[PDB]
Scaffold this active site. Structure first.
Site, mmCIF file in Angstrom:
data_model
loop_
_atom_site.group_PDB
_atom_site.id
_atom_site.type_symbol
_atom_site.label_atom_id
_atom_site.label_comp_id
_atom_site.label_asym_id
_atom_site.label_seq_id
_atom_site.Cartn_x
_atom_site.Cartn_y
_atom_site.Cartn_z
ATOM 1 N N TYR B 886 1.872 2.935 7.229
ATOM 2 C CA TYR B 886 3.379 2.737 7.393
ATOM 3 C C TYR B 886 4.394 3.491 6.284
ATOM 4 O O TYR B 886 5.321 3.516 6.608
ATOM 5 C CB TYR B 886 3.365 1.375 7.490
ATOM 6 N N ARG B 921 3.809 -1.444 12.263
ATOM 7 C CA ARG B 921 4.159 -2.753 12.322
ATOM 8 C C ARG B 921 4.095 -3.069 13.791
ATOM 9 O O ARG B 921 4.824 -4.098 14.172
ATOM 10 C CB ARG B 921 5.737 -2.760 11.902
ATOM 11 N N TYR B 1002 -0.777 -5.390 -0.062
ATOM 12 C CA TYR B 1002 -0.865 -6.682 0.702
ATOM 13 C C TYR B 1002 -2.167 -7.519 0.029
ATOM 14 O O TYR B 1002 -1.880 -8.675 -0.218
ATOM 15 C CB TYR B 1002 -0.993 -6.678 2.067
HETATM 16 N N1 LIG Z 1 0.124 -2.886 12.252
HETATM 17 C C1 LIG Z 1 -0.120 -3.949 12.620
HETATM 18 O O1 LIG Z 1 0.252 -4.280 13.766
HETATM 19 C C2 LIG Z 1 -0.567 -5.083 11.665
HETATM 20 C C3 LIG Z 1 -0.748 -6.404 12.252
HETATM 21 C C4 LIG Z 1 -1.048 -7.515 11.488
HETATM 22 C C5 LIG Z 1 -1.336 -7.331 10.169
HETATM 23 N N2 LIG Z 1 -1.063 -6.062 9.584
HETATM 24 C C6 LIG Z 1 -1.645 -5.404 8.326
HETATM 25 O O2 LIG Z 1 -1.102 -4.139 8.045
HETATM 26 C C7 LIG Z 1 -1.972 -3.541 6.877
HETATM 27 C C8 LIG Z 1 -1.778 -2.269 7.158
HETATM 28 O O3 LIG Z 1 -2.180 -1.514 5.924
HETATM 29 P P1 LIG Z 1 -2.187 -0.160 5.525
HETATM 30 O O4 LIG Z 1 -3.407 0.791 4.973
HETATM 31 O O5 LIG Z 1 -1.586 0.726 6.613
HETATM 32 O O6 LIG Z 1 -1.134 -0.165 4.334
HETATM 33 P P2 LIG Z 1 -1.217 -1.048 2.813
HETATM 34 O O7 LIG Z 1 -2.628 -1.212 2.554
HETATM 35 O O8 LIG Z 1 -0.519 -2.021 3.095
HETATM 36 O O9 LIG Z 1 -0.601 -0.121 1.747
HETATM 37 C C9 LIG Z 1 0.593 0.829 1.841
HETATM 38 C C10 LIG Z 1 0.687 1.824 0.873
HETATM 39 O O10 LIG Z 1 1.804 2.674 1.088
HETATM 40 C C11 LIG Z 1 2.269 3.030 -0.153
HETATM 41 N N3 LIG Z 1 3.888 3.196 -0.196
HETATM 42 C C12 LIG Z 1 4.994 2.576 0.396
HETATM 43 N N4 LIG Z 1 6.094 3.173 0.275
HETATM 44 C C13 LIG Z 1 5.783 4.348 0.117
HETATM 45 C C14 LIG Z 1 6.481 5.416 -0.168
HETATM 46 N N5 LIG Z 1 7.872 5.636 0.081
HETATM 47 N N6 LIG Z 1 6.129 6.794 -0.346
HETATM 48 C C15 LIG Z 1 4.654 6.725 -0.728
HETATM 49 N N7 LIG Z 1 3.775 5.723 -0.697
HETATM 50 C C16 LIG Z 1 4.522 4.659 -0.275
HETATM 51 C C17 LIG Z 1 2.167 1.724 -1.088
HETATM 52 O O11 LIG Z 1 2.255 2.223 -2.461
HETATM 53 P P3 LIG Z 1 2.992 1.713 -3.703
HETATM 54 O O12 LIG Z 1 3.043 0.108 -3.258
HETATM 55 O O13 LIG Z 1 1.759 1.568 -4.679
HETATM 56 O O14 LIG Z 1 4.293 2.115 -3.846
HETATM 57 C C18 LIG Z 1 1.117 0.903 -0.493
HETATM 58 O O15 LIG Z 1 -0.075 1.635 -1.312
HETATM 59 C C19 LIG Z 1 -3.249 -4.214 7.550
HETATM 60 O O16 LIG Z 1 -4.088 -4.300 6.270
HETATM 61 C C20 LIG Z 1 -2.885 -5.593 7.693
HETATM 62 O O17 LIG Z 1 -2.901 -6.565 6.836
HETATM 63 C C21 LIG Z 1 -0.806 -4.772 10.550
#
Ligand SMILES: NC(=O)c1ccc[n+]([C@@H]2O[C@H](COP(=O)([O-])OP(=O)(O)OC[C@H]3O[C@@H](n4cnc5c(N)ncnc54)[C@H](OP(=O)(O)O)[C@@H]3O)[C@@H](O)[C@H]2O)c1
Ligand SMILES: NC(=O)c1ccc[n+]([C@@H]2O[C@H](COP(=O)([O-])OP(=O)(O)OC[C@H]3O[C@@H](n4cnc5c(N)ncnc54)[C@H](O)[C@@H]3O)[C@@H](O)[C@H]2O)c1
Ligand SMILES: NC(=O)c1ccc[n+]([C@@H]2O[C@H](COP(=O)([O-])OP(=O)(O)OC[C@H]3O[C@@H](n4cnc5c(N)ncnc54)[C@H](O)[C@@H]3O)[C@@H](O)[C@H]2O)c1
Lengths: 827, 1038
Positions: B886, B921, B1002
């Site tokens: 995201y 999201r 998170y």
């Molecule tokens: N998508 C859905 O429908 C849904 C539904 C329910 C739950 N979820 C939750 O969504 C989560 C998605 O996890 P994910 O792996 O996609 O993300 P993530 O584990 O939450 O981590 C996002 C990463 O993006 C980095 N980041 C943020 N802004 C940035 C920017 N401008 N430039 C560079 N890096 C940036 C952050 O690094 P820094 O913070 O260190 O800067 C962070 O390490 C799931 O684990 C779940 O819990 C999603």
């Protein structure tokens, strides 16, 4: 006298080589045992294989005889590696120790040796050339230059490392990245591709280049990264060889190499054009632009070199980068090369005289291509002193019709014809009940479409039985049309009694042969399941229903929904090999719940109740006792045997309706539909009857396996269908009982004839498709029976069976590589 | 004041090696950029790099300072390879040229050299022995003997050939076949394993042998033929090092080697026993039994030998067998030896003083086995002139039995053993008898026939919708929700029936069901515009031109075909309802194969138009009331069109969460509007108790669908906070609200008064809104998309409610199509993480595969580079897999990424995307963002289609994703996200992660993919880094 000289009087001679630092010998002990197998006598000079790591004991045991030097060259066959020279030890040229009219097998290069040819013409002998062998398809098993190119390329790769001070592979240790070496290869022939393979297997990466198009493809085959030159030239001269290229191409290629030279670590150039010098491709200002510690190998140092900087035989480290520029590469792998070179001679000598002992090889002037006379003319350079080195010319041969606007047009056509059909069904509605029934009909159709799609090829026929059993539910039409008292008083009740008698057999026998087509999967290691637990819905669903009839609750419609969903669960769970027992149990519960609901849907007379009970009981008993005493090998045989009744029952039910609804017609609203749909029901059931009979007869060895063709093979079916369609106009709103009944008889008999004609000329290899087809047809008869009787269960179950059977017939056609039109109509 | 001497006034010195035939140097030019980034000053002797091909220009441009020899040795730190010996070019010991109380870095071998330690104790120095480093788990980067053994084991293979006569590989040549060569190894240490690798990769036959048990296993993992003997004595002594054997075992081993010695061609013996000389394992008459031309290489020639015939520094051909007995194999590859030894000294100096600038480095005495204090105590041989070489024992010793290795997926296979097939069958049979009791219960509650017909069409619509939702493309879940928000606009049909009066409404009931039509006419136009704007971003520019206007041809055929059927006097409304319902089923059914998506949008348009026109024609109003209805629908469609064309795509979920709330309002404004308008019938009706209960339940469903949606909006736009609002007792309060809601039907029945029923309507609407606000704000900003989709189901079911209420047949089929879609999307998203729906809603701890306490800790250090390594490493790689998250689209950084991919696939690379199901999201959001940026849909793969191509992959760009690339999901049984199916990005060659800082999003306090030795960090903002990569690719390729 055969034209030749026997092998016992001839002898071959293997000298040692007096040439400077020559290590390989002409024959290995693997090659001394051959020709003794063939018939020659082998004479080997003493110190011959010592540099080649071949001791004389293998030669004494292999059949040869170690002897001197003055008499080894004085033999009938002299087999050397390099052409003979002036011997400094004996003070005489080696051609002066040859015998008169001997035979010499060597590298010669006759265009480069005029005086050797003169001195051999003085000895009046026959000389073959190992290096003038034409590269054709059949002579690739004996090609000395290809073998020496292969060994020279491998030697250059294995010699590049042991001077390069870093790895080729590179690994991510938990101590730091080490990057791989990056090797460039100029010229993809035999040496270059072998080098590329040895370097690619060792761990480096290769970015080879050649002017031809096939060699670049073979670099892609070996895993290299072929380079493309901007100037789009050709790379071919009089065949598949290399021509001397234009200067614009040279200065483009050298610009490309100057770009590549700053980043590679090992450059192995192997460029050589025929008949001329090696092309200079690298300047001194071009080559010094590499990193310190690079290793740069040339293999074309014999006829010049590819570099401006190559001393042919030295390893001078010019400005921190090493030149490996030997001209004798195979001589450093003498144990290897003397094998393959020996194999290059043995397969020569077995081919030129392919018989017991004659040694003839006719040297003829006429030769075309690929023939061995081509090889014999090309190879012999001197015949009895007279030189024939310019070889003559080769003879005869030196080798969307759919325009996708129309796709969108036909798609929109299909959907707009469908929406018009929905409107046309809407306009002709008699009342609300027809609209509601078409709604639940269309939904059952889609549910039946999506619900198979996942069956296993072991499980085509183990589910068809259940559809048979679920198509045994034509008996409700008999159950809603019996009456009077214990005996059937009226003929409509008599036809209903016949229908519900013949259609109980289908239910009972179809579920029992399902149970017997599931026992044939149970291996003797499988964990004991507990099928009687599946009785826990049934007494809950059937018997728990009965208190609601004891408590005055009139539950029939929700029971129909329950039985329909149980039938869907049957067909669904019986499609993935783990839940087949669950599908069988749910089909049983669905039939039981439906029949109990329609049984309570009349609240009949007690004698009438005893009548219906006796009829279904006797039918179920017969359906059990047929399906139990039979083999296993007649189970898919049996299904059509219990399918033939099924549509027949529908026919009777349709006829029954026309007999029971004829006095109600004169003051009727819904009067046409209860004749038109009854007519179609009669057609479908009669075709089902006769077709399933012909199916069983063709599977039971009564008829053959051959489709019995006819003279009229589609005129006949067209005439039957034309009379069948025109059977609906003789009751255009007519008040006659007689013309209606004879129309029913006409369409029944013609439907039987039509089913015989269709299912006859088929063949007993598509008959398990035809069983699914007729089982698909009978569901539409069930839907017709539902429309006549206003019954939701028959509508839902019939649509489910119809679409599921047709989609399984399509999947069975998908399992093999056939269509359905080419299967049925005799393509 | 901090305890230490800072790096600025602390200098180092690198001398040239003086030992005979030594070509190594201790520091590379790649090794003097570290220690200058760290803070020292570097002085190199003027001829130190010339042997290992390190020009002095690389030193003085790398950060060095070229001086002579007497002043490079009198430096604050002396770093060299070997022990400082007597200098021959001026007779003086090199300990004399040291700085007084300085510090030395080299090999020492103190137990073999106490005499040199005398000269070191005279100069009061501190000594760090490279060889005396104990081999613990935190000491892989600094292990010099392992590195030298690795290079020696490779060099022995590549030096054996060029002396062996024939091929190693062997092939079927058309001239004739050659067999591969046979290679024997004796003793698998590190050198033997490297030789096994070098021989196996060249195509040989390897049959190595060793006494210890695990080394033979590592042989057969390397692909050798691990031999055995017929005598069983345990080879291991004190530890991973071996010991001496019994004499009879030596006899049987030499019998085995004498049996195989007549067969192989290359043999390399690395047998070396610590504490004494190497064992002799071959006799001289044993070794003359080989073939004439074999190559025999001994790697133990310095410490005795494994042969009684090995000259310690020379080749010789003994009766036809070469004896390569070189004592300095790494001194032949001085370039690679210097680079690895430089890396070892670099990581040693980085690890010993992790302070920023003190260089304190204390020696301790009591330590745990494995800590840094153990390495410091075992490494320092002389500390300030005194000898501390006998190391103390490691207290707190581990290893009673160090074997767990319990991987995550093993546990659920263990849990599958508890699932005895009696209980499988029983738990299958209970669900069906529960369902059939449900069927009989719904039967008993029937007042007449029409309700039963409605139940049947509801059930079949549910199965149709369930099967047609699994058929959609996984790359189109985000248009899917939008078209359901289009199809859920059919509460307008619920609005127009109860809608009466004149130009203006007359009663209050007619005014509620005009507001209902108004707020429903937003959803139709808005959903179809946003679906239309989304589907043509998936159209590639090379596609055939799409002639969609032909699909106006059925619509005017159907709807206009209705009107002439109304003009001529019929009643087709129950068949028009079926036609529109099948069009609505086809709206999702054609939305399944990426080429018929616009087909599946136009069918939704045809169905909604036909259904509305059918209801209108069935009404037959006056032209005053028709004018009122037309004004209401045109105003609602005006607003819905004019807000659907203003937003960006990434603000889509808010709009999606906005489209549910209006429907959650609309059912409430249609349920109440019927409870008023059906009031004079309840005493004279049999179904009167039916149309009250339904008129209750729909008010609940929209009553939850309304309020919670506004909170799900309010957190995602940012008006409400990102932190979950937890109440002290929120489980009791939610359960008490649900108890009040299910108890509110008791006064609603048994009591026919008007005022007491309408206050039950207002009561259940109020308490349902409170229930939605209470449940919704306590979720959390990450899991909020679940509230996006689950409410999508409820908005479906509200439709089903009024399909039972108005006795309409279209609304049931449409609502059962929509609620099934919402349920299946919520199921997919609760499968893609291993959480359950109650764990998400009620807020339990972690995933369902969570074991008990103590998650694992990290081990290792993180590697970080710049843009230049990044661009050159992108240029070298030929297969790039990109996993965004995201954070890519949070910082608007997809626009350089699509341009980057279009540039890199012109060059002839194979660049693809791998999208995790919950990255974003909203389900399927990132597909639409990547289609907006301009990526063709054929190179966007899902998790299931790409997860077995990571081994065959050069480079992986992880962009803004942490939990979708966490490896602890498959290794830690105690992690917070164990068992969640992830991307296996660590199974490739080189990994780049781009994020701001080393933090968390998170959960998961540290991600262990950041520390594996082929992971490079590229810290920074994704926007500037990605378009700088765009700019560098453009400037360097052009
Ligand atoms: N998508 C859905 O429908 C849904 C539904 C329910 C739950 N979820 C939750 O969504 C989560 C998605 O996890 P994910 O792996 O996609 O993300 P993530 O584990 O939450 O981590 C996002 C990463 O993006 C980095 N980041 C943020 N802004 C940035 C920017 N401008 N430039 C560079 N890096 C940036 C952050 O690094 P820094 O913070 O260190 O800067 C962070 O390490 C799931 O684990 C779940 O819990 C999603
Ligand atoms: N069965 C058969 O008859 C058979 C089988 C294999 C190959 N062949 C032929 O034999 C040849 C195999 O190559 P070889 O190694 O034996 O011959 P070779 O020694 O002439 O190879 C020289 C290589 O350099 C390349 N080269 C020439 N001029 C160049 C230039 N200016 N720039 C770059 N590269 C240049 C050539 O294309 C070739 O790849 C091919 O011509 C092939 O068609 C025949
Ligand atoms: N996780 C860990 O603890 C771990 C991991 C990797 C390495 N290590 C350490 O690194 C060492 C690697 O070995 P090395 O190369 O440094 O030592 P080395 O070169 O001294 O190994 C000598 C080899 O010869 C073998 N050998 C000994 N006596 C023999 C005999 N009589 N006959 C035949 N073979 C015999 C030994 O088993 C060993 O394979 C391990 O022994 C261990 O102590 C530890």
């Amino acid at each position: 006298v055969k034209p030749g000289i026997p092998y016992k009087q001839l002898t071959v001679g293997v000298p040692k080589e007096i040439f400077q630092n020559e290590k390989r010998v002409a024959l290995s002990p693997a090659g001394v045992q051959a020709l003794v197998k063939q018939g020659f006598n082998v004479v080997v000079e003493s110190g011959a294989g010592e540099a080649s790591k071949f001791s004389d004991d293998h030669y004494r045991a292999a059949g040869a005889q170690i002897q001197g030097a003055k008499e080894v060259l004085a033999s009938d066959l002299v087999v050397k590696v390099r052409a003979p020279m002036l011997n400094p030890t004996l003070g005489i040229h080696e051609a002066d120790l040859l015998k008169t009219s001997g035979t010499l097998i060597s590298f010669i290069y006759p265009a480069q040796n005029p005086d050797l040819l003169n001195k051999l013409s003085k000895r009046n002998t026959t000389v073959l050339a190992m290096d003038q062998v034409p590269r054709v398809t059949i002579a690739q098993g004996y090609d000395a230059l290809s073998s020496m190119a292969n060994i020279a390329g491998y030697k250059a790769v294995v010699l590049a490392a042991n001077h390069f001070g870093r790895f080729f592979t590179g690994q991510i240790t938990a101590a730091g990245k080490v990057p791989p070496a990056k090797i460039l290869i100029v010229g993809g022939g035999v040496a270059g591709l072998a080098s590329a393979g040895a370097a690619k297997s060792m761990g480096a990466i290769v970015r080879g280049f050649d002017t031809r198009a096939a060699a670049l493809e073979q670099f892609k085959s070996l895993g290299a990264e072929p380079l493309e030159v901007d100037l789009k030239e050709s790379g071919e001269g009089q065949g598949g060889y290399a021509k001397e290229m234009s200067k614009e191409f040279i200065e483009a290629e050298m610009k490309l190499f100057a770009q590549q030279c700053k980043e590679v670590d090992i450059l192995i150039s192997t460029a050589l054009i025929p008949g001329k010098k090696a092309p200079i491709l690298f300047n001194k200002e071009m080559i010094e632009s590499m990193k310190e510690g690079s290793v740069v190998v040339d293999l074309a140092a014999e006829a010049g070199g590819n570099f401006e900087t190559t001393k042919p035989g030295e390893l001078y480290v010019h400005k921190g980068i090493t030149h490996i520029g030997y001209t004798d590469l195979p001589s450093r792998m003498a144990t290897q090369a003397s094998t393959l070179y020996s194999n290059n001679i043995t397969k020569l000598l077995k081919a030129i005289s392919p018989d017991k002992d004659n040694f003839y090889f006719e040297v003829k002037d006429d030769f075309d291509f690929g023939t061995m006379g081509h090889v014999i003319r090309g190879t012999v350079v001197m015949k009895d002193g007279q030189v024939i080195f310019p070889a003559p010319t080769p003879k005869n041969i030196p080798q969307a019709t759919i325009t996708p606007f129309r796709k969108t047009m036909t798609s929109a056509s299909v959907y707009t014809a469908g929406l018009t059909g929905i409107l046309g069904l809407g306009i002709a509605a008699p009342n609300l009940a027809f609209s509601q029934m078409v709604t639940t009909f269309g939904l059952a159709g889609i549910v039946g479409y999506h619900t198979v799609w996942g069956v296993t090829p072991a499980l085509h026929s183990p589910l068809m039985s259940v559809t048979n059993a679920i198509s045994g539910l034509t008996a409700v039409g008999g159950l809603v049309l019996m009456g009077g008292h214990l005996y059937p008083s009226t003929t409509s009740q008599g036809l209903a009694a016949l229908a519900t008698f013949i259609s109980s057999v289908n239910i009972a026998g179809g579920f029992l042969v399902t149970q017997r087509m599931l026992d044939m999967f149970k291996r003797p290691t499988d964990p004991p399941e507990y099928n009687y637990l599946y009785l826990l819905p049934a007494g809950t669903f059937v018997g728990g229903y009965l208190a609601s009839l004891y408590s005055g609750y009139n539950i029939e419609q929700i029971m129909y929904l329950g039985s329909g969903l149980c039938c869907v669960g049957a067909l669904a769970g019986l499609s993935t090999q783990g839940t087949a027992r669950l599908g069988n149990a749910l089909g049983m519960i669905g039939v039981a719940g439906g029949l109990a609901a329609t049984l309570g849907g009349l609240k009949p007379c007690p004698e009438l109740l005893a009548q219906m009970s006796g009829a279904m009981a006797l039918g179920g008993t017969i359906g059990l006792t047929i399906a139990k005493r039979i083999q296993i090998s007649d189970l898919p045989q049996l299904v059509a045997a219990f399918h033939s009744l099924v549509g027949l029952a529908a026919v009777l039910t349709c006829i029954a309706e026309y007999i029971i609804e004829y006095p109600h017609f004169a003051t009727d609203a819904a009067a046409n539909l209860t004749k038109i749909v009854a007519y179609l029901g009669t057609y479908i059931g009669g075709v089902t009857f006769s077709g399933s009979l012909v199916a069983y007869g063709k599977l039971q060895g009564i008829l053959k396996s051959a489709p019995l063709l006819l003279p009229g093979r589609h005129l006949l079916n067209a005439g039957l269908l034309a009379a069948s369609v025109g059977g609906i106009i003789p009751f255009m709103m007519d008040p006659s009982f007689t013309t209606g009944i004879t129309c029913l008889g006409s369409v029944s008999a013609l439907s039987a004839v039509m089913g015989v004609t269709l299912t006859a000329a088929i063949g007993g290899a598509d008959m398990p498709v035809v069983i699914t087809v007729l089982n698909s047809y009978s569901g539409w008869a069930l839907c017709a029976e539902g429309f006549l009787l206003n019954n939701n269960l028959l509508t839902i179950v019939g649509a489910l069976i119809g679409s599921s059977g047709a989609i399984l017939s399509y999947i069975m056609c998908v399992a093999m590589n056939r269509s359905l039109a080419n299967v049925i109509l005799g393509g």
